[PDB]
Amino acid sequence: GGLTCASAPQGTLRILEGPQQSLSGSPLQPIPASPPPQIPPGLRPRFCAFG
Amino acid sequence: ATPFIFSEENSALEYFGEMLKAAGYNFYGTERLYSGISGLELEADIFIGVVYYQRLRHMVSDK
Incomplete structure (x- = not known):
């Protein structure tokens, strides 16, 4: 449990929800x-x- | 008489003239009026109709 300083990270993952677009992009309904x-x-x- | 319901293709005057033509009146809203002072039929062809008037509260009795 010395808690030494580790190295710099390589990159970044970022998790977030994606929207669903199977509905939109349809022909418009005016x-x-x-x-x-x-x-x-x-x-x-x-x-x-x-x- | 809602605004923006008559275009230039289907005009308002065409519509209400066809209504007046269907009623046996003039297409352009005019009638043959006579003179109540002279008795003679006026040479012009006088535009008459039904307009909804409003009476405002500004009276000469208060002025």
Whole structure:
């Protein structure tokens, strides 16, 4: 138990978690565009001129 | 009347003109008005509609 000074280390291992990327890199999934306003069907001339 | 729902391809005036055309009115919002003072039909073709007005609280009775 003299606890002498040992030599300098050769290198460094570093352990850390890696993320999973099987999900991302996929084609994007955007929010679907709301439709442009379309005229309602069944619009008729309700007003007829008097006389 | 939400903003940014009408593009330049599908215009707002085209849409509401097709609605007015389907109702048997003019495509451009105008009508044949007459003169209530003269009796005669006005030569111009007067743009009329339905606008929602607001009454502000600033009255001349407080001023």
